[PDB]
């Protein structure tokens, strides 16, 4: 009963000093010979207007042209980033939406929120407009993230402390990813789609296995709710943004902290992180009406993306690395280059 905890503590100590014994250097000590990015300035090329309520999430497209955005007005607007157009506007059965997704093939769009149901939508119906294809029920908490593995599967985060892996056609949870001790906030999917990390309220990020279905690693270090998560482009690292006014880069191989991205005169939280194509830029959408541009190798601010009249809540970089999208609570999306 109580004999298990006193040796779980020494197992934790074994993990901690095994990570400490494998930390002969840091990321910053061997990146000093790299010339810095400098002070890069990005301009708002497109100002996607048309929402009315606070946008909470957006997801890009694999073709790097279309994107989707979810807002409290109850609409899933599918934009056209090049021409500032709107190709679809899906009405939601429940207006309380906290996340949205987009298919790697571009055929489907997911959403979910306080109704605890992940609604999949089919954009290529020949019978007419976009209608609900499948409603994935089975979560007892609010859906907070959802990523399509492909047209067949989805990996969803929820506030019931458990993640999920739904087969869409059967509409059932094939695999459940439990192990956290807090409400799970956001999950990022690996480029090879075989693993995925997820942050939660317990200030920990867990790297799971998509096929096998177990937790492989647990990363600590934050002091508050981890709101955002994003894989590094090679799949061997990831960056988490938390409410403790800092971002941290972890490592799937060294299995410990790599670098913190903190700055003085910053107290607001981070709700979105996203990497560039080369991974040199870590874009973090803060809560002080801005979206700071960080360097993932020198841990210095190379820029800032101001122009939003409320809290930036969601980011995104296209698959070809061309642009940066930035939603906010001021009912506006923006594109940067």
């Amino acid at each position: 009963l109580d004999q298990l905890r006193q040796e779980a503590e020494q197992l934790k100590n074994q993990i901690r000093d095994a990570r400490k014994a494998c930390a002969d250097a840091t990321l910053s000590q061997i990146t000093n010979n790299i010339d810095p990015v400098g002070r890069i300035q990005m301009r708002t090329r497109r100002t996607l207007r048309g929402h009315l309520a606070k946008i909470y999430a957006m997801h890009w497209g694999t073709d790097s042209r279309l994107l989707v955005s979810a807002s409290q007005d109850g609409k899933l607007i599918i934009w056209d980033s090049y021409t500032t157009n709107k190709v679809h506007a899906i009405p939601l059965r429940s207006s309380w939406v906290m996340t949205c997704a987009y298919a790697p093939s571009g055929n489907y769009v997911a959403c979910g929120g306080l109704d605890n149901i992940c609604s999949i939508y089919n954009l290529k119906t020949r019978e007419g407009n976009v209608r609900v294809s499948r409603e994935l029920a089975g979560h007892t908490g609010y859906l907070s993230c959802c990523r399509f593995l492909d047209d067949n599967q989805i990996v969803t985060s929820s506030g019931d402390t458990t993640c999920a892996l739904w087969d869409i056609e059967t509409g059932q949870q094939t695999t459940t990813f439990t192990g956290h001790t807090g409400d799970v906030m956001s999950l990022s999917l690996a480029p090879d789609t075989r693993l995925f990390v997820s942050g939660a309220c317990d200030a920990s990020a867990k790297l799971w296995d998509v096929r096998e279905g177990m937790c492989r690693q647990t990363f600590t270090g934050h002091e508050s709710d981890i709101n955002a998560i994003c894989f590094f482009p090679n799949g061997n690292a990831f960056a988490t943004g938390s409410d403790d006014a800092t971002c941290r880069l972890f490592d799937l191989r060294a299995d410990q902290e790599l670098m913190t991205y903190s700055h003085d005169n910053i107290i607001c939280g981070i709700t979105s992180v996203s990497f560039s194509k080369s991974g040199r830029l870590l874009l973090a959408g803060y809560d002080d009406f801005n979206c700071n541009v960080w360097d993932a190798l020198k841990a210095d601010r190379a820029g800032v993306l101001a122009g939003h009249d409320n809290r930036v809540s969601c980011l995104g970089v296209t698959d070809d690395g061309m642009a940066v999208a930035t939603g906010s609570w001021d009912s506006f999306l923006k594109i940067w280059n």
Binding site: G50, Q72, K75, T83, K86, T140, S144, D183
Partner: protein
Amino acid sequence: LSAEDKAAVERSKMIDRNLREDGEKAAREVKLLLLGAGESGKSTIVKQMKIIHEAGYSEEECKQYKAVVYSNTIQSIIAIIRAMGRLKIDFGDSARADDARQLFVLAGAAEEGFMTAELAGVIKRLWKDSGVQACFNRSREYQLNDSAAYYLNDLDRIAQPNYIPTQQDVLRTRVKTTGIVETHFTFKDLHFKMFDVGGQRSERKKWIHCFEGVTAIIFCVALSDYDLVLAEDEEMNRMHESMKLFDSICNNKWFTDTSIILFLNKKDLFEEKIKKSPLTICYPEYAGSNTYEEAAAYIQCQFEDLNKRKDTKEIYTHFTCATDTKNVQFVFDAVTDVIIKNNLKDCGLF
């Protein structure tokens, strides 16, 4: 520039037109959020508002609500029988003890809402006992549903799960849906949007900013919970935890100026419980008399003194029974005041 993609521009224009129409239709309404403690009467309040305004209920909806009724009767009789094992109240005779034994046996194997007539007879013979009525009277020493008398006084003689229950049965029973519950009704050219957080036992902080922009917060406080206690540590009060929950809601950063429609529910139980049990069980420093008016005003003034911004944020404390026609009129008056304030916020007036 007169290209092939002009169809895309026309589609975007019609999408913008329809979306603007939907947005103005949404902005021509009023949105309210329900908050309160456990079993305070919020769902019954909005069910009454929906019944008197929108419509009744469907056949299949009444079917799952009768399933909820059967689950509620089973849970209530299980609690009221197992309360004797801790409160030490003996049965009238050995026949009722055998009836309780077979009730435990039947509750150990549950399939659906079949409601065998033997089980109904067991319920009837158990409820027709002096000890069970005594523990029903002494039920303030533990937890019990406030509609258990309604189930065990009228729904005992149902005899078959073959026909839909009455609207009163649906009104007093709520589902265990963990998701958010949204009800719509129209009262004098306003479209009300009640947002009951049914279940949602998840940190109360990652979606409390989703409601920054609601018109008002209909808080609910059970008046009959001043003498009841919680069977988890036996060191806290239900009224006191309702008070601190109201204090945490009122001091929230997202509801700095959001008006509160404070409903003090279950006055029909408070007025009949304050005759026997004094209010001094809840507040040990209460000095007034044990009358309904003074005690109710005392609870109201404590809940209003929880507010720290009384000069700008208004609280509408109304004593309600959750089965009243004036219940929606109180809400209408409060939201009309808030709409007047919002229409005064622009034009440089307020």
